[PDB]
Nucleic acid binder design. Structure first.
Ligand SMILES: [Mg+2]
Ligand SMILES: [Mg+2]
Ligand SMILES: [Mg+2]
Ligand SMILES: [Mg+2]
Ligand SMILES: [Mg+2]
Ligand SMILES: [Mg+2]
Ligand SMILES: [Mg+2]
Ligand SMILES: [Mg+2]
Ligand SMILES: [Mg+2]
Ligand SMILES: [Mg+2]
Ligand SMILES: [Mg+2]
Ligand SMILES: [Mg+2]
Ligand SMILES: [Mg+2]
Ligand SMILES: [Mg+2]
Ligand SMILES: [Mg+2]
Ligand SMILES: [Mg+2]
Ligand SMILES: [Mg+2]
Ligand SMILES: [Mg+2]
Ligand SMILES: [Mg+2]
Ligand SMILES: [Mg+2]
Ligand SMILES: [Mg+2]
Ligand SMILES: [Mg+2]
Ligand SMILES: [Mg+2]
Ligand SMILES: [Mg+2]
Ligand SMILES: [Mg+2]
Ligand SMILES: [Mg+2]
Ligand SMILES: [Mg+2]
Ligand SMILES: [Mg+2]
Ligand SMILES: [Mg+2]
Ligand SMILES: [Mg+2]
Ligand SMILES: [Mg+2]
Ligand SMILES: [Mg+2]
Ligand SMILES: [Mg+2]
Ligand SMILES: [Mg+2]
Ligand SMILES: [Mg+2]
Ligand SMILES: [Mg+2]
Ligand SMILES: [Mg+2]
Ligand SMILES: [Mg+2]
Ligand SMILES: [Mg+2]
Ligand SMILES: [Mg+2]
Ligand SMILES: [Mg+2]
Ligand SMILES: [Mg+2]
Ligand SMILES: [Mg+2]
Ligand SMILES: [Mg+2]
Ligand SMILES: [Mg+2]
Ligand SMILES: [Mg+2]
Ligand SMILES: [Mg+2]
Ligand SMILES: [Mg+2]
Ligand SMILES: [Mg+2]
Ligand SMILES: [Mg+2]
Ligand SMILES: [Mg+2]
Ligand SMILES: [Mg+2]
Ligand SMILES: [Mg+2]
Ligand SMILES: [Mg+2]
Ligand SMILES: [Mg+2]
Ligand SMILES: [Mg+2]
Ligand SMILES: [Mg+2]
Ligand SMILES: [Mg+2]
Ligand SMILES: [Mg+2]
Ligand SMILES: [Mg+2]
Ligand SMILES: [Mg+2]
Ligand SMILES: [Mg+2]
Ligand SMILES: [Mg+2]
Ligand SMILES: [Mg+2]
Ligand SMILES: [Mg+2]
Ligand SMILES: [Mg+2]
Ligand SMILES: [Mg+2]
Ligand SMILES: [Mg+2]
Ligand SMILES: [Mg+2]
Ligand SMILES: [Mg+2]
Ligand SMILES: [Mg+2]
Ligand SMILES: [Mg+2]
Ligand SMILES: [Mg+2]
Ligand SMILES: [Mg+2]
Ligand SMILES: [Mg+2]
Ligand SMILES: [Mg+2]
Ligand SMILES: [Mg+2]
Ligand SMILES: [Mg+2]
Ligand SMILES: [Mg+2]
Ligand SMILES: [Mg+2]
Ligand SMILES: [Mg+2]
Ligand SMILES: [Mg+2]
Ligand SMILES: [Mg+2]
Ligand SMILES: [Mg+2]
Ligand SMILES: [Mg+2]
Ligand SMILES: [Mg+2]
Lengths: 122, 130
RNA sequence: AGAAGGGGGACCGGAAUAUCGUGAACACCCUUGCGGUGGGAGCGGGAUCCGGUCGCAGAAACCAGUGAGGAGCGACUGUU
RNA sequence: CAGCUUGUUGGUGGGGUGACGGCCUACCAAGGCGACGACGGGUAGCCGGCCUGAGAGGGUGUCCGGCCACACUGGGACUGAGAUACGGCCCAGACUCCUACGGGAGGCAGCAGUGGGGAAUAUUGCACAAUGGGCGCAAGCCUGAUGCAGCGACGCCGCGUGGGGGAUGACGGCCUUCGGGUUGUAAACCUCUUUCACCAUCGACGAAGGUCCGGGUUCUCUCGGAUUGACGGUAGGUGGAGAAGAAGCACCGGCCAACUACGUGCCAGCAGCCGCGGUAAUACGUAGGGUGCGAGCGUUGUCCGGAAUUACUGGGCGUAAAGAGCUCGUAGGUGGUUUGUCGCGUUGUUCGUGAAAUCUCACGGCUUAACUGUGAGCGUGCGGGCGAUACGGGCAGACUAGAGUACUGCAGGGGAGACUGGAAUUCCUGGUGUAGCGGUGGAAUGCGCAGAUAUCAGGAGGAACACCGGUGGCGAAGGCGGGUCUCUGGGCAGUAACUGACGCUGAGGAGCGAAAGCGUGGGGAGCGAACAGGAUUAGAUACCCUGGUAGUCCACGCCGUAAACGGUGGGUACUAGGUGUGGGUUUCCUUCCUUGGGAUCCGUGCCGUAGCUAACGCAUUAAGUACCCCGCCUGGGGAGUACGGCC
RNA sequence: CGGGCCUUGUACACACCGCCCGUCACGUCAUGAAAGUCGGUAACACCCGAAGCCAGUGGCCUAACCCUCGGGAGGGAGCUGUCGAAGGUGGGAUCGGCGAUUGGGACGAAGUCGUAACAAGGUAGCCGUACCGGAAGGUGCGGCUGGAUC
């Protein structure tokens, strides 16, 4: 609109939102994983999702999702947390990395075996 | 009322679209020079200057084919009074990849892109005609 | 609201002989008066700056607001 | 974040400095900066460059190179050509250590290394052989610079895990319509070559150098001699035997290359999106098969892209988000025709500069490549000189077409004030008169029988102005109609008398601005929020009925909002027509009395071509074609809300 | 009551046995207010003021220079003064955290109460304003058609 109007008042880009908020710049983040429990997803899914409350070293309390089938988590226990959305749990935006400090890999897993953590066979 | 050259281009464009055979419009030296360029490039038939009630009137007859098709496809003012546009001899504009004409006002007068590159002079880009 | 909270304050000398501000004698005109203009003497007033001096203390004795915050009641000065 | 500044702004005389200077001081004046954002708050080392992108742009400042700042925190000076003086001095502070308690010592953001933090980042290595550096006449001595090595797939590049024949459709696996298909020339087997790894051996270039000895006297020059390399017995070369020592990861619903079986059975689970799983799942887990890539392959994090979803290139605002309620006007932006000049913009050319590296194009060298050297580009720019004057601009003129003024007419519910008219409703007084009236879909509440409603005469008072009246007029918008008088604004047409571009728009700002509402005073017929009763209803805080206060009215102030709407900012020019209506002018047909037709200017409607639009529709009163200025939009909610501020 | 054709409105398409609004109850998340309370930041006024530079003073000390041999010149130690970091006192500014209690918001299952809107949605609907009401809302005044009527 009106090169003079642009000179007086330039263009301003849109405002995005930070997504790595708990990680605050880091690709992964360590946590203590208090109060493990289960959750039911949004309306048309009716499942039983495995989650955990993780207190990160960035001094933030977030909720993470535990992928794979079957886990060894408990109360206070060190986990490594990464980013990732679940799209059916309301506000879960983090995932527990499987194959890290306390979360051993998925047993009997044979396909893709690197996600979920698993050595080939020896 | 601002930018009489844009007024001139708009009058000619509207008449050409309306299939008119001629236009009348107030006469100025710049418009006369642009009309001369257009006739030399073959986008119009001959033009002439009358004497109206006050000042002089410039009349242009427009050119059509055997069938009823326009010889002028487009017209657009480039250097507007709200944003002047200039170019150097290195990067003079190209209209329709070269099948058109861009009017350049140089220290040597009005010129087209070919005539201005052959002389190595730039200036203000008045309008594209093609 | 003098909110609160702070700083200076004595004496001596110098600036300072019109330093500055009050009144204005001797002597300067005139429609001569209980008149006017300049003039600046002597006598008093106040403040500042600089240097020095003294004591524990310079508002010197007498004299001369305590301040701040939150509620209740009555608006207020008044009256019993 | 709207007011900041008193050595502050300027001057004079001094002081001070390597140097100009409020750098400092005494005096004098009262200035200086600010909407082109002062002062304040947040964040940040800057650049050559790097990543992305068609480009313009966006993100970034890590290796390498340049500049700046700092050296436990804060301050200060000294020495010197030169000081943020990292491994100097003084003081203060925090911390660690020694002490005979009086007092002392220290500073890895140098290399290596330790603890800690963290998702995460290395050896307490070798050598001064080369280059640079300091002192010395020199030999020399010093150099954690540097030259290399170690470690980490951390990255880029390159090469290997063999090659040539070979349906036992080996065997087996898996699927099968039980016939076969597939893995698959793939294996077995036959044969061939050994890049790299392994073993043995020779062994560098980097050194037209550094040293001492000889011609050369020295200077310069070779000569030849020893000797000197951390890397390193390394790279490389040569030779030996053997397919010999060496492949994995992701995915296969669509995007997007890649499909079947079994198990499971809204469970377990998957998922970037939308979705997949509730008994025949190509979407979950396994198998077979396939696809992509390969010493890598996936996930997470971040940036660009796609995104024309901030639009300069390159978007929009009738109804999708988006024209301020309307106007006047400040800064600003933009500007009609024409003459001369300047040469600021613009443009041509030349000189300087735009370091190197990186980037592009061509070669040159490492066995190739990555990497490296050379040459030309690039470096969009800036400064100096010399040309041009079309356009923009400045300066000096001219003109009347835009704008304004003058005169003469014209139409109008435009505005304000004062006075004034009649119809009707209500009430009061009186006459007649008697039992109902009122109200609804049906009723009741209510009024009346103490004389209502009805009807006639008189009176009081307030508000609104039937017919005219419309689609029509006026006003910037909101709005404006009983009449008369007084005062007052704008518009149109004609004339062309006057001025001579005086124009347009307009951030902020100011003014006006329906109704409701607020303050003070007055008034109050009718209507009528709230309120009360009746009715309906399951209920009825409503709709319907009977009452009824504020308010509606007036004076003077405030408020400043409306679906304040044409849901369409203002100005200007241009682009078929047809047909109504309001206000002019005007020939001709001038009587064809017709106040008809034509022409022209200014309004206000309908219909329609081109054109535009997602469509609906708009269409000379544009939502078409263009130019100038302004306001506004960037998914839906949260929300036109909170906090701050102004009123 | 049901059906057929045309036309009109629609926020319905599981197609009115449709869609859908707002209180209330339970839960979760984020957020405003709040007597007060805990931190951070940058200043400001005044008090005190180390080192050091500069300016003075300087009987105490002082080899070069001068001397008439007594001393003089010039210097220094010390001392005073301006400026001065750190510290202290005070009143404010500003950025955050927590806070009994309290306001709304969003999302939740197959909870309770009505039925406001969409059809003439059963009283046309929306806009501004005012009063009222469990709640959607109602009513008054003015406006609009993004409604109807002959
Ligand atoms: Mg006081
Ligand atoms: Mg007080
Ligand atoms: Mg004393
Ligand atoms: Mg007192
Ligand atoms: Mg109280
Ligand atoms: Mg009490
Ligand atoms: Mg009292
Ligand atoms: Mg009271
Ligand atoms: Mg008193
Ligand atoms: Mg001064
Ligand atoms: Mg001076
Ligand atoms: Mg920083
Ligand atoms: Mg692009
Ligand atoms: Mg520092
Ligand atoms: Mg440190
Ligand atoms: Mg320091
Ligand atoms: Mg030196
Ligand atoms: Mg020195
Ligand atoms: Mg220092
Ligand atoms: Mg140090
Ligand atoms: Mg050090
Ligand atoms: Mg040093
Ligand atoms: Mg180190
Ligand atoms: Mg860690
Ligand atoms: Mg750690
Ligand atoms: Mg060396
Ligand atoms: Mg050397
Ligand atoms: Mg790895
Ligand atoms: Mg495919
Ligand atoms: Mg199955
Ligand atoms: Mg699967
Ligand atoms: Mg993106
Ligand atoms: Mg873009
Ligand atoms: Mg654009
Ligand atoms: Mg758009
Ligand atoms: Mg527009
Ligand atoms: Mg809408
Ligand atoms: Mg809209
Ligand atoms: Mg409007
Ligand atoms: Mg102006
Ligand atoms: Mg102007
Ligand atoms: Mg101008
Ligand atoms: Mg012009
Ligand atoms: Mg370069
Ligand atoms: Mg080569
Ligand atoms: Mg040049
Ligand atoms: Mg005129
Ligand atoms: Mg009036
Ligand atoms: Mg009455
Ligand atoms: Mg009667
Ligand atoms: Mg009667
Ligand atoms: Mg004239
Ligand atoms: Mg204006
Ligand atoms: Mg404005
Ligand atoms: Mg007003
Ligand atoms: Mg009103
Ligand atoms: Mg009132
Ligand atoms: Mg009230
Ligand atoms: Mg009143
Ligand atoms: Mg009534
Ligand atoms: Mg009523
Ligand atoms: Mg009632
Ligand atoms: Mg509004
Ligand atoms: Mg209106
Ligand atoms: Mg609007
Ligand atoms: Mg307009
Ligand atoms: Mg327009
Ligand atoms: Mg008309
Ligand atoms: Mg569209
Ligand atoms: Mg139409
Ligand atoms: Mg449009
Ligand atoms: Mg508000
Ligand atoms: Mg507020
Ligand atoms: Mg039929
Ligand atoms: Mg339909
Ligand atoms: Mg709740
Ligand atoms: Mg709060
Ligand atoms: Mg001192
Ligand atoms: Mg609380
Ligand atoms: Mg309703
Ligand atoms: Mg309803
Ligand atoms: Mg109803
Ligand atoms: Mg209704
Ligand atoms: Mg009500
Ligand atoms: Mg209402
Ligand atoms: Mg109404």
């Amino acid at each position: 609109p009106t090169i003079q109007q642009l000179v007086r008042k330039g263009r301003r880009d849109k405002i995005s939102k930070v997504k790595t908020a708990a990680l605050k710049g880091s690709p992964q983040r360590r946590g203590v994983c208090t109060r493990v429990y289960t959750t039911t997803p949004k309306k048309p899914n009716s499942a039983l999702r495995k989650v955990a409350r993780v207190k990160l070293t960035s001094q933030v309390e977030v909720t993470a999702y535990i992928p794979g089938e079957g886990h060894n988590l408990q109360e206070h226990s060190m986990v490594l947390v990464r980013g990732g959305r679940v799209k059916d749990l309301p506000g879960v935006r983090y995932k527990i990395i499987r194959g890290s400090l306390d979360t051993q890999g998925v047993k009997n897993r044979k396909q893709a075996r690197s996600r979920y953590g698993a050595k080939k066979e020896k | 009322m601002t930018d009489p050259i844009a007024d001139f281009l708009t009058r000619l464009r509207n008449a050409n679209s309306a299939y008119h055979d001629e236009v009348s419009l107030p006469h100025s030296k710049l418009k006369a020079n642009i009309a001369q360029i257009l006739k030399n490039e073959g986008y119009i038939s001959d033009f002439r200057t009358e004497d109206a009630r006050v000042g002089k009137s410039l009349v242009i007859q427009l050119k059509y084919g055997p069938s009823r098709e326009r010889s002028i496809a487009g017209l657009r003012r480039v250097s507007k009074p709200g944003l002047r546009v200039y170019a150097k001899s290195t990067n003079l504009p190209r209209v329709l990849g070269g099948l058109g004409v861009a009017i350049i006002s140089t220290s040597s007068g009005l010129l087209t892109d070919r005539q201005a590159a052959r002389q190595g002079v730039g200036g203000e880009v008045l309008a594209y005609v093609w």
